[PDB]
Amino acid sequence: VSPVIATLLLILIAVAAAVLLYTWVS
Amino acid sequence: VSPVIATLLLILIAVAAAVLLYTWVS
Amino acid sequence: VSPVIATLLLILIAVAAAVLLYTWVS
Amino acid sequence: VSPVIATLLLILIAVAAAVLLYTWVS
Amino acid sequence: VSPVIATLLLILIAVAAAVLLYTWVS
Amino acid sequence: VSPVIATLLLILIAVAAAVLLYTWVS
Amino acid sequence: VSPVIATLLLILIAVAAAVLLYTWVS
Amino acid sequence: VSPVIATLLLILIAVAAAVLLYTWVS
Amino acid sequence: VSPVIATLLLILIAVAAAVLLYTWVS
Amino acid sequence: VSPVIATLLLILIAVAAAVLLYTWVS
Amino acid sequence: VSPVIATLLLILIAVAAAVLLYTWVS
Amino acid sequence: VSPVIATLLLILIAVAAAVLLYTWVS
Amino acid sequence: VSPVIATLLLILIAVAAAVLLYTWVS
Amino acid sequence: VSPVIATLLLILIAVAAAVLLYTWVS
Amino acid sequence: VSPVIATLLLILIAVAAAVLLYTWVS
Amino acid sequence: VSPVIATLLLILIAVAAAVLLYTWVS
Amino acid sequence: VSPVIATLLLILIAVAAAVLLYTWVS
Amino acid sequence: VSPVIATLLLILIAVAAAVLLYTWVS
Amino acid sequence: VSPVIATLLLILIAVAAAVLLYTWVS
Amino acid sequence: VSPVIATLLLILIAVAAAVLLYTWVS
Amino acid sequence: VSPVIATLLLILIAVAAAVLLYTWVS
């Protein structure tokens, strides 16, 4: 069940990036 | 037990593709 | 790990619907 | 690697059913 | 993705309990 | 290559039984 | 031990076909 | 060493038939 | 597909433990 | 081609025994 | 060299019979 | 079908090791 | 039935090698 | 050339008897 | 019983060759 | 005991021919 | 010792004929 | 056709011994 | 019919020797 | 032509004795 | 009955020579 690990990685990056945006908008 | 490897490959692609979609919808 | 995607979909709908209600109550 | 498919089926049902419960509790 | 359900349960209890405290302090 | 079929049977039973347990624990 | 090769072939086809179905259901 | 050829024939049939069953059970 | 069950077990423990920490920090 | 039958027997036993071990380890 | 023919006959029967048994055991 | 058992062993180790890493990164 | 033993040997090597690759790709 | 006939008779018996033994050993 | 040896030789070659093909297909 | 030599010759041909057929069927 | 030659002739024919039968049965 | 019996005996021993080795390697 | 005995002797030696070779090749 | 009868007698004994030896060697 | 002895001699040579050929062909 490795794929699950990777599938969660890019997602976490999507969040971190999303955070670096919600700060630019605010 | 090679088939198992391939059977998991296309699936991983289905996930990667699914991710490239969940971002288009969001 | 597809199920996770679907399991989150209906939930998001439950939220959107919940929002369309919290506005009716307010 | 078919078993894996079935083993994931009933599980998905356990989730769907769980959802039909988390709504009854809320 | 069941764990997520449980992980949110005890947390909700931590909130309910926290509320039963913020009223005792006020 | 029959043995392979049987060897997979009891295993599938071990899974089904395991599922009937992961539900008792949860 | 040729039969083993063939016996695994149709099975692999059963998987590929199964995959072309798990996508139709999802 | 002909017998060996025949002895393997019916066996292969037992497999093919077994496959036409493992699909009915699944 | 048993490994998946175990792989999720220790993880759930990591969460429970994490919760027993997020309460100590708060 | 009898030997082949016996040669496969003890092997099947090695599998059954192996299974009675993979359960003790898990 | 006729005997050789007969000596192989009963043996083939021993195989056919053995097959009608390996199916009863399986 | 022993190889299958071993082929799954090292993989399980790859997971356990992967877990001992996902904790170091987090 | 020796050939069967050898025929399975190189195959096992193909798996071990395949594993030493699935780790390089991941 | 009669002797040849007899000389082959007892031999055939030695085979039949040998067969009634190879079955007891197997 | 020499023929048996040769009859098994070319067959083993058919397997080795078959293996050099199952790798080209995979 | 020459006949024995010839009697085995055509038989070997029957095998070689049989092999050139078991490949056409497979 | 001519008779011996003839006595072996018809026998060889009995073999050739027997072969033309073992092929019809197989 | 006795030799055939013996020629198969030592071979069977080579298999049994081979099995007592494939277990030491595994 | 003595010659037949000798003619079979050297042949048996050719087999034993052949066996001491099929083991060197394997 | 009596001598011929006797000359064949001792020979037949040489065969019978030879048989009582080929069994001791085998 | 001497001729019989000689008549069998050259024949035995024909066999020995035949053997020195069946080995060249094999």
TrEMBL record, chains A, B, C, D, E, F, G, H, I, J, K, L, M, N, O, P, Q, R, S, T, U:
Taxonomic lineage from the root: Archaea, Thermoproteota, Thermoprotei, Desulfurococcales, Desulfurococcaceae
Q: What is this protein called?
A: Archaeal Type IV pilin N-terminal domain-containing protein
Interval of the full protein contained in this chain:
8 to 33 of 310
| Transmembrane region(s) | 5-25
Which organism does this record belong to?
Ignicoccus hospitalis (strain KIN4/I / DSM 18386 / JCM 14125)
